[PDB]
Each structure stands twice: as structure tokens, then as C-alpha cells.
Write a protein that binds this ligand. Structure first.
Ligand SMILES: [Mg+2]
Ligand SMILES: [Mg+2]
Ligand SMILES: [Zn+2]
Ligand SMILES: [Zn+2]
Ligand SMILES: [Zn+2]
Ligand SMILES: [Zn+2]
Lengths: 444, 444
């Protein structure tokens, strides 16, 4: 259970590339605690498989480097995340964000596209809904639009992830539409969920006015206000927030759609590793100084939430790792993995200081990006990059001919630190994660 | 620690997909032993990254299934395996078998192609040479030609993995050529090394004649015998062996080149998942019942080796997972993973019964194969397969336009069982493994 995993010296010399100093047996033994967890922080890097972690590490820290947050969690294991075919109820080997998010927040497998409901479309309670009942403070932050599948799965029970607001739901999830007697669209269900801290993007859908209920005729943004929600939309305002609870809930909408990616770089191309020069990522010029970073929202959330004596549950998500992976854009993707590392460092720092906090870093499913040989002549999209090592790393994207690269089904890394983290070691399922949290928090 | 990680029951019902039956903490704390290990069995799945394990589990065992061998090692982590650029000494992100094998057996990074030497071409001892010197019995089994990089890295110090016999070394490694005062080719160095048990393929190279020294003029097979080596070429004759030591070492040559793969299936093709029907793998009609399985060689090796009270070191390799991966042949590739699983079961069973053995299952590097959606339209090679779940699974190979699929650089799974297994947890490096075995065996 070591904190420093960088290569220890000259990597060309005997034992120069070792990440271990001594024997972990004792340190590890001392990391094993099955005492209760007062708090739980779940960081999800959407689409961040082992391939994604290695590429970003090579680039940003060098092959022999180590993410001070991401790679610093002592207990590790691999976990499966297959979905189910709605009709046959047989495994669908490649899940989407909705079906996977539903498994870790609910504990039951479901079809791709479902939020908070099993394949019979029967809804089950989420871990956020349960923490809220037990008395715990709750938080949900993401760099994606709030209506998106990963954050939404924590507060919504919809049969299709496309049922963002009033209009969308009417046609795509009519049985869910408030009018037809349903609980409502994703945005309305979020507004009803009423977690203490909810931060992200997706202000666009709050411009939709409801079609029924008390706030019918009034936009969803107005409803939020007419319900006690403190609305913040930039860095300075979030910062001013002094508190958030069931009387003063916090709702941050920092973007119309998704929040802006950290780095800019070009899209991979056919033979781009052999036709075009090596690229060096650069800060995204269009990201306004006032849009909060993932680490800042995570920081602010942990603060307000830590003011609760019963404890808290917080889910943080680095959404655009996945999205940029789909876009076949190495830089945006690596930049988003770097961003998330920052959030994890903030998470861990509090954890070691608090002592009863269980922190977990993982992903919902694997993705397309592959690290390959510099001289690789691939059928898909490639790009050469200038890593921190002063060397070149080529990235490959070859599982789709469409405009979007595809998710993949390989099992991936799950890492934890804190009381009950041993339940992450070995082979487990995406559903175990749910039970691990339910048990650590004593929400049973 | 759990020896049963298959889904609990109905994967479509809450808690049904779970693999955990309880809290791992105490079971996991009781597996953490830092007492010395008397023996070590290192099983390597060549090119078996996490992706290769999942695809083989979904096919052979079902998504919710579980490899009774591969998936049963309690302590897990992920490790980096980058090679070095010979010139600059900067990291080379995608390693070849020779430089990765050299790393775990030697503890020093090296360039791709190098067996047993650092970037300066300076020779460094391997873990087998150390075990042998300490008095421990040694074994080296694999399903590839014995001169291949994985087995070779343990007994040979060559500048190019191409220097198999006398004729290729003269021209390709003249500084190693016996005639030039060099230690000799790979085969000649294997014969000198003198491990107690050596099993695999690659007999054709033994037909070459030494160009200098004590056995100059005699083919390599003759030198083998002349030096007290017992030679066995089939299942039967292997079965009838009762001992193997420094007085009568064993040498199995079961194939001219590599041993034949277990399953037959078509090669993945362009748009193979949409244009060609789903496939069910079958037994390879070319494999003789005369040819022992990796499980059989493993078992026999453990029996003969286990007669040394002082200990033994053994390395097993399911070689063709890699080779079939390059060939874009899902069936051959999965058959080789199923086969390596039988070997890990033999290893594990012995280890639980002996109690002082450290068992480690990993791979040398990641490869091409990816698990993707059945409806996927990819630029590379694809194929649909009928799994045990009665569902279709599509596998994609898309990082090369040439006739061979490339390795990839993603960190991959490393798992262990036994004394000093806690050193496999978390993030580590391939070189760390060398040090982990040295200190477990007290080979210091
Ligand atoms: Mg997401
Ligand atoms: Mg090999
Ligand atoms: Zn996702
Ligand atoms: Zn995605
Ligand atoms: Zn290999
Ligand atoms: Zn290979």
C-alpha cells in the first residue's frame, strides 16, 4: 500500500524502472479495514479503461510516471460490466452508459438505454435515494449535461436515456411522462430527487416548461427556484455558496450542454501517424476562465457535504473521456483523464484526512483507443504524440467506420481506498459495487 | 479471497449478477502472507490482456461465468510493460515478447528483440540461473518453439531473438556466435543452462550442427544426448518419465515449430460480423492425441520438479493466444486461453495443497482483439461467435492493415496466490515482478 509508484530511478539500469520500494504485505494488511464507512466518494471516468489510463499517463507523466490520484489507490481489481438484451434477457456483451450506471447504482442488470429500471421496466431504488433516506447528505457532479446517463441514473427511473425533458419524454417514454401519470422526464425527476449538491452542465433542457403538475407552464429552471434550489452558473457564484441541504439545495448549471474539454488537439486520421507530424496538446482557448474544473466542483461539493454529521455519498464523473474517445480525438480524451486525476487527488486528500471515507475510481465500460507501434499502418484513425518522455506515442481507433468510435467489452480496473475497499480486489461485477456501497454505509 | 466468482443466480434479477458472496476483508487479510515461498510457478499468457480474458470467458464460460483457474487468484493489480528505444534509451510504449520476458526474468528494461541483455548489450542473469545456483530445481514449459523469446529469455543472452541456432547467430548475432568466442546461439545456450525440466516445441533447430567447441560437428540433438539429456517427443514417452535432475535433465520436443492449437475456426474478415454467419469453434483436427496439452506438460513438470525439497521455479506459457491474436483468429485464440486455464488449475491445486507456493498469472503485453457490439461496422477484421449464453459476441481486430495484428501498450492484469502475492497488488512494473520472485524465494 504505497503512495509513490513512479519508476524509482534510471529506467535503463537494473531495477531502475521499479515502482515498488519494498514489500507491500504489511502496508497492505494495514489498509484492510472492514469497519463502517461514514462517507463514500465514487469517481467514474466515463469510458476510462486500462488503455485510457496508460495512454494519458504516458503522455502526461511519462511511461515511468504515476498519476498522483488515479494510480494511488492501494487495493485494485478487474470488474465485468455486460448488459442484458431486453427481449431475451441474455447478456449483451457491450454495455452503454445508462445500463452500466444502473447496475452500480441499483444492483440489477438491465438493457442498454434504461435508467433506474430492470428489463421488465420495473424501477428500483438507487444508492443516492437510499443514502438520502438513511439521513446522509448527497452529491452528484459531472462535466456532462445533467440529463446524461451517468449522473441521471442516480435520480431517475426512465425506460430510455433520451427522455431528458417534457417534450422528449412524451414521445419516447410516454408511460413516464408526468401527464400520462408518470414520474416525469429525467430533468423533472432530478428536480424531485433533491440531492443536496448537484453540479454539471445541461442548462438547455431547463428551458423546457412543464406540461402538467404544479409548475406546468413554467420552465424547469423556474421550478427549481420555486422549490428552494440555489442556482449557480459560474466559478465565482459556486464559490460563494456557504451551504447546501434539503432546505437550500445546490444546483449548478455551468453549460448549456456538456462542459468544455480541457485540451485541444486535432482528430485522428487515416495514416495520421505516418502522414502527419507528432502533435502536442494545448489548452482549450474557448474554455472561459469562469467555468469550474472537475477538481473545483469536487472540492466545493466535499466541503458543503462534509458539513453533515450522518455522512455523505458523492458521485463525481469525468464525462468527456468517453465522448472524446468517440470523437477519435486523443488530446481531448487525455486532457479529460488528467482533469479527473485532479478530482481524485482532492477526493483522496480528504479521505486520508477524514479516515472513514471510502473512495473508488473506475469506469462504466471500456472504449476504443489503443496504444500501438509508432510505425503502425492501421485501417482506422491514428495520431502520433509527443509524450513527456520526449518520445512518440501513437494512438489508434479502429472499431468503427461511423463518425463515432465504439465502446468495448473488456473487463477493467476498479481501485479503492478506505474502509470496505477489499471488496474491490479480484474479479467482481459492476453490480457488486452497489452492494459494496450499501454495506459500507450500512444502508442495509 | 473467493474460489467462486461466477454470478450468484438470475442475472436479470437484483443481486443475481453478483460474484461476491460476502465481504472479502477477512478472507483477503488471511491471504496476505510475507513468509518465504519455497516454490514459484509463473504462468504467462502471451498477449493475454484483460480484453483477451473477457472474450474467452464470455465464449467458454458465459458472461457471468468464471475461469476456475485464471480468475481464481485472490490478489490482483495492473502492471506496465513498456520497452526501451535502444538508441535514445527513451521509452518505447509497445513491447515485443523478448524485451518484456527479459524484464521479468532479469529486472532490467531492454530494447525490443533483446534476450537477456540491457540496451548496452551487457548480459544480466535471469531468475532461472539464480534459482539453479541456489540449488532449486528449475522448469520451463511452453507451447511455442523453445527458442521463442518467452522461454528463451530465461536461459539465453542474445542481442536478437532471431539467433535461434548456429547458422542464424553467425550472421545475426556474430558477437554471440560460438566461433567468435560468444556464449552461443539460443539453442546452444538452452542446452548449457541445463534446467531440470524443459518442455515445448521447436525441434527443427536441434538438427543444426555446432560450428565450434566440444560438440562441433554434432547436431544439437546429439549434443543434448551426449550431455545426459533425456529426450521425449510425445504424450506417451513423457508420461513414462519418473525423474529429472542435473544428472538426467528432461527435454521435450513435441513439435517442429510451435505446438498445434486446440480449436479451429475461420479467420476474422472485413465486415465478417454482418456478411458472414456466427461461428461456433470446433476441435483442430490437426492436433494429434500424441501431442500433450499445456495442462499435461504443466502437471508432469510439477510432479518431477516437486521432488526437490529445497524448492523449484517453473515458468509455463500458453504461447499461441498471442500468435492466433496476430492471425485474427478468435477461435484459436480462445482455445489457447481455455488451455492456459487448465494449466492454472493444475498450478493452483498443487499450491493450495503445498501451502508455500507463489502462483502468478499474467501476460507479457496487451494485444489487438477487442469485444464490440454485434451490429458494429468496423474498418478492420471482425467475426461473430455463439457463446455459452446462447448469445452472439463480436470480436474486432483493427490496428493493422498488414497480415499481422499488432501488440498494444495498455497496462494489463497481474494476479497472484501464495507467499509474497501482495506485491502484485496496485500499480507496479514488469521489472518489479523479477524482484518479487527473487525476494519470495529468498534467492537474494
Ligand atoms: Mg457519462
Ligand atoms: Mg512467446
Ligand atoms: Zn460510458
Ligand atoms: Zn460512450
Ligand atoms: Zn508476447
Ligand atoms: Zn506477438
Amino acid at each position: 500500500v504505497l503512495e509513490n509508484r513512479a519508476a524509482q530511478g534510471n529506467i535503463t539500469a537494473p531495477g531502475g524502472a521499479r515502482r515498488l520500494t519494498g514489500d507491500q504485505t504489511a502496508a497492505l494488511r494495514n489498509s484492510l479495514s472492514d469497519k463502517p464507512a461514514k462517507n463514500i466518494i465514487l469517481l467514474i471516468g466515463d469510458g476510462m479503461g486500462d488503455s485510457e489510463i496508460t495512454a494519458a499517463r504516458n503522455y502526461a507523466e511519462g511511461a515511468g510516471g504515476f498519476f498522483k490520484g488515479i494510480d494511488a489507490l492501494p487495493l485494485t481489481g478487474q470488474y465485468t460490466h455486460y448488459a442484458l438484451n431486453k427481449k431475451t434477457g441474455k447478456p449483451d456483451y457491450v454495455t452503454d452508459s445508462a445500463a452500466s450506471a444502473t447496475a452500480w447504482s441499483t444492483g440489477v442488470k438491465t438493457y442498454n438505454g434504461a435508467l433506474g429500471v430492470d428489463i421488465h421496466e420495473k424501477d428500483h431504488p438507487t444508492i443516492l435515494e437510499m443514502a438520502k433516506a438513511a439521513g446522509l447528505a448527497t452529491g452528484n457532479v459531472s462535466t456532462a449535461e445533467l440529463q446524461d446517463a451517468t449522473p441521471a441514473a442516480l435520480v431517475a427511473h426512465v425506460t430510455s436515456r433520451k427522455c431528458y425533458g417534457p417534450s422528449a419524454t412524451s414521445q419516447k417514454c410516454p408511460g413516464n411522462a408526468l401527464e400520462k401519470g408518470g414520474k416525469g422526464s429525467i430533468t423533472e425527476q432530478l428536480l424531485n430527487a433533491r440531492a443536496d449538491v448537484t453540479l454539471g452542465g445541461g442548462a438547455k433542457t431547463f428551458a423546457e416548461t412543464a406540461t402538467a403538475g404544479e409548475w406546468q407552464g413554467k420552465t424547469l429552471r423556474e421550478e427549481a427556484e420555486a422549490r428552494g434550489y440555489q442556482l449557480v452558473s459560474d466559478a465565482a457564484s459556486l464559490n460563494s455558496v456557504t451551504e447546501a441541504n434539503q432546505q437550500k439545495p445546490l444546483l449548478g448549471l455551468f453549460a448549456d450542454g456538456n462542459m468544455p474539454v480541457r485540451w485541444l488537439g486535432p482528430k485522428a486520421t487515416y495514416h495520421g501517424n505516418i502522414d502527419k507530424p507528432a502533435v502536442t496538446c494545448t489548452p482549450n482557448p474557448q474554455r472561459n476562465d469562469s467555468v469550474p474544473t472537475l477538481a473545483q466542483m469536487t472540492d466545493k461539493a466535499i466541503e458543503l457535504l462534509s458539513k453533515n454529521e450522518k455522512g455523505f455519498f458523492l458521485q463525481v464523473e469525468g464525462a468527456s473521456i468517453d465522448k472524446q474517445n468517440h470523437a477519435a480525438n486523443p488530446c481531448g480524451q487525455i486532457g479529460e483523464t488528467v482533469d479527473l486525476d485532479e478530482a481524485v487527488q482532492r477526493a483522496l486528500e480528504f479521505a486520508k484526512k477524514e479516515g472513514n471515507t471510502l473512495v473508488i475510481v473506475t469506469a462504466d465500460h471500456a472504449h476504443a483507443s489503443q496504444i500501438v507501434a509508432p510505425d503502425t499502418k492501421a485501417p482506422g484513425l491514428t495520431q502520433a504524440l509527443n509524450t513527456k518522455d520526449g518520445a512518440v506515442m501513437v494512438m489508434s481507433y479502429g472499431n468503427s467506420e461511423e463518425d463515432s468510435q465504439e465502446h468495448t467489452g473488456s473487463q477493467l480496473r476498479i481501485a479503492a481506498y478506505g474502509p470496505h475497499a477489499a471488496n474491490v480486489v479480484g474479479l467482481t461485477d459492476q453490480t457488486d459495487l452497489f452492494y459494496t456501497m450499501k454495506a459500507a454505509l450500512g444502508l442495509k
